[PDB]
Amino acid sequence: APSFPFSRASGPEPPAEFAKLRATNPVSQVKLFDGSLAWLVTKHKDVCFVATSEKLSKVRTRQGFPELSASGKQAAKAKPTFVDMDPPEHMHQRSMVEPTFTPEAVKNLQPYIQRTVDDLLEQMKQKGCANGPVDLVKEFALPVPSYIIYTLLGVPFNDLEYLTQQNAIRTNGSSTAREASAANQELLDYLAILVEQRLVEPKDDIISKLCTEQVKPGNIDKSDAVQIAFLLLVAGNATMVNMIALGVATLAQHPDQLAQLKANPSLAPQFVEELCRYHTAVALAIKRTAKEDVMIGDKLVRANEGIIASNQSANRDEEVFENPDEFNMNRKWPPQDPLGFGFGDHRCIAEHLAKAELTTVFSTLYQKFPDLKVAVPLGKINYTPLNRDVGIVDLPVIF
Numbered sequence: 001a002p003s004f005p006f007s008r009a010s011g012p013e014p015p016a017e018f019a020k021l022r023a024t025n026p027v028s029q030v031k032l033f034d035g036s037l038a039w040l041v042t043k044h045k046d047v048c049f050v051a052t053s054e055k056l057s058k059v060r061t062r063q064g065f066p067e068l069s070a071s072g073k074q075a076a077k078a079k080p081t082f083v084d085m086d087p088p089e090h091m092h093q094r095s096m097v098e099p100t101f102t103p104e105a106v107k108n109l110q111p112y113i114q115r116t117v118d119d120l121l122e123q124m125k126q127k128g129c130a131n132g133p134v135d136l137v138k139e140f141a142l143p144v145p146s147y148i149i150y151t152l153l154g155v156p157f158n159d160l161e162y163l164t165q166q167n168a169i170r171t172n173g174s175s176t177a178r179e180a181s182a183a184n185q186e187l188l189d190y191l192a193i194l195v196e197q198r199l200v201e202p203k204d205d206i207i208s209k210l211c212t213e214q215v216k217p218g219n220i221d222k223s224d225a226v227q228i229a230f231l232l233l234v235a236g237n238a239t240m241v242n243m244i245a246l247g248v249a250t251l252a253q254h255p256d257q258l259a260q261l262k263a264n265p266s267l268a269p270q271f272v273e274e275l276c277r278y279h280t281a282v283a284l285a286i287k288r289t290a291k292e293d294v295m296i297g298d299k300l301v302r303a304n305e306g307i308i309a310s311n312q313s314a315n316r317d318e319e320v321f322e323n324p325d326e327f328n329m330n331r332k333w334p335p336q337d338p339l340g341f342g343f344g345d346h347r348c349i350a351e352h353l354a355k356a357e358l359t360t361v362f363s364t365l366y367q368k369f370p371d372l373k374v375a376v377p378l379g380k381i382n383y384t385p386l387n388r389d390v391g392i393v394d395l396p397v398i399f
């Protein structure tokens with residue numbers, strides 16, 4: 001059994017192991033860091049089964065749960081938030097914060113998302129690049145999702161820049177363990193203050209709704225409110241930043257597709273759809289433990305055995321997506337859902353918001369900067385370390 005997780009084949013590529021497994025061993029066992037074994041599911045149909053089976057659990061206190069790192073094992077000791085819950089607890093807590101993320105709410109949020117993107121791009125234009133390239137990540141990819149989530153949560157305008165930087169330090173590969181920890185705890189302390197504040201004087205934000213509708217009535221306590229707001233912040237921010245950066249790099253890699261997008265920004269939604277399939281930046285989130293024996297393919301997963309369902313491999317499943325390793329914004333989509341945002345009950349709560357942020361970015365970026373170009377050879381792009389989910393650390397650009 002090979003050690004899992006695998007390392008990407010290269011900066012912008014998924015691990016090479018998946019294609020071979022899909023072809024000759026779709027459901028197999030892998031060895032985790034602690035020496036325990038777990039079942040790796042690689043086919044789309046099977047990943048969907050794992051994501052919806054009621055015989056499988058997300059509860060991390062169940063022996064056999066596939067923790068992939070020492071830190072993951074430690075984090076499993078804390079009181080869980082809906083991300084690690086099974087029904088009925090899952091939706092009982094998730095429904096507390098779903099309103100802001102519904103397709104309807106996101107549609108009504110479009111003007112705000114557009115304004116945020118516009119202002120950040122305008123800031124870039126004003127600053128210019130007369131003295132050399134600027135980092136697209138620091139100046140745009142990072143602040144866009146950060147400002148939006150922080151604002152929706154309840155953070156005041158004047159605190160956005162500092163908090164965006166601290167949250168970045170949390171996941172920056174350059175941060176030492178102490179630095180990452182300090183930034184993490186610091187964000188929690190800040191959220192605790194916002195909760196105390198909103199409890200006394202609620203405003204029009206997520207934290208206020210949690211305080212008024214859940215804390216005051218006694219449905220949850222203050223610390224719970226903090227953890228839920230914290231989950232909403234850290235769950236998808238780093239991913240968003242990486243998706244925006246990967247999107248820009250991808251368009252640079254395929255000139256004609258960038259030409260097409262520039263000539264028709266209405267293709268942004270299709271482009272984002274392909275981007276979320278092709279670059280599955282969150283590939284290790286669909287994990288379960290079997291509550292009882294369950295058959296998957298030609299394998300029997302016994303009770304208490306862990307399962308890791310690769311949505312990344314599923315999105316490259318040739319049986320569902322023809323020419324899966326080809327990035328094509330004009331792709332003819334099958335009836336089967338690409339799994340960039342997961343599947344089933346736990347499917348990304350912010351899928352619609354995430355898609356809206358990305359479509360707003362890619363329907364605007366090249367209208368504002370039609371001559372935007374990565375200021376370094378594409379093969380020299382600084383990607384996240386290969387043993388991590390795909391992403392880009394910094395991306396110098398000129399325009």
Ligand code: HEM
Pocket residue numbers: 051082083084094145149231232233235236237239240243276281282283285286311339340341342343344345346347348349350351353354355
């Ligand atoms: C393009 C960026 C994003 C991608 C690709 C992404 C992807 C995912 C994936 C694969 C999962 C696992 C779903 C499953 O268990 O089947 C997930 C869960 C989740 N995501 Fe996102 N996400 C993104 C952005 C966001 C944002 C912006 C937020 C916060 C506003 C967020 C909050 C969450 C939460 C809280 C969960 C747990 C949901 C649950 O277990 O019920 N995500 N996301």
